[PDB]
Amino acid sequence: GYDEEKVNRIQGDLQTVDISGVSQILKAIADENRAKITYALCQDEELCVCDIANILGVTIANASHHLRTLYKQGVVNFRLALYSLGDEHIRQIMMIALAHKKEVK
Amino acid sequence: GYDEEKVNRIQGDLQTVDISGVSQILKAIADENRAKITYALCQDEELCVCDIANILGVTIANASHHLRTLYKQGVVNFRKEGKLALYSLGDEHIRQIMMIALAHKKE
Ligand SMILES: [Zn+2]
Ligand SMILES: [Zn+2]
């Protein structure tokens, strides 16, 4: 084969982490509208579903659907239901991707 | 309307930020194979396309195609040497995104 020891070791490294779960969580945030929601909750502490539907310019059903999806991945929490960021890890991923996207070259 | 002032303001904050671009880069990393490439590049400074293909268990052509995508979205960089093309994480932002995403999912 080719570089089998290094390759087998990195496959091992991948097998020991939930790369699948990373893909799910990033996919949830990556949706245009869910990314807007996530950014919106980085700025205001809590929003209700109607605020979110109006901000996004989408139906209340669509916003509910988007919040359900974020909720399943811990991206948002709820406490009328008011939504907030799941935790500080979500805030940091947002701010880091935004910083990275401003770089030149 | 409903909460027009708050909605207006937040729409205003959102307009100042490149959310479209954030979506593009997160989508690039989220793909199941491209997430594995990204994590794999957290384990060595540089890997060649052949290592990446063998780690994923994909063809060298399919590996190339993921790497092109990652490259275009600024997730990976590369240099040529031998010649042989060597790919690395863009910078620490990508490592942080990967590691923070992993941390969140296990909590
Ligand atoms: Zn960066
Ligand atoms: Zn977390």
Swiss-Prot record, chain B:
Other information: The N-terminal, regulatory metal binding site 1 has higher affinity for cadmium than for zinc. The second metal binding site has higher affinity for zinc and has no regulatory function.
InterPro entries in the cross-refs: ArsR-like_HTH, ArsR_HTH, HTH_ArsR_DNA-bd_dom, Metal_resp_trans_reg, WH-like_DNA-bd_sf, WH_DNA-bd_sf
Effect of H93A: No effect on repressor activity
Protein's name according to its UniProt entry: Cadmium resistance transcriptional regulatory protein CadC
The keyword Transcription regulation is annotated on this UniProt entry: yes
NCBIfam families xref list: HTH_metalloreg
Positions with a binding annotation for Cd(2+): G1, C48, C50
Function, as annotated: Metal-binding repressor for the cad operon. Involved in resistance to heavy metals, such as cadmium, bismuth, zinc or lead. Binds 2 metal ions per subunit. Metal binding to the N-terminal regulatory site causes the repressor to dissociate from the DNA.
Keywords on record: Cadmium, Cadmium resistance, DNA-binding, Metal-binding, Plasmid, Transcription, Transcription regulation, Zinc
DNA-binding region, residue range(s): 49-68
Stretches assigned to the HTH arsR-type domain: 14-107
GO MF term set: DNA binding; DNA-binding transcription factor activity; metal ion binding
UniProt keyword annotation of Metal-binding present: yes
Subunit structure, interactors included: Homodimer.
GO process terms (BP): response to cadmium ion
Superkingdom of the source species: Bacteria
Positions that bind Zn(2+): D91, H93, H104, E107
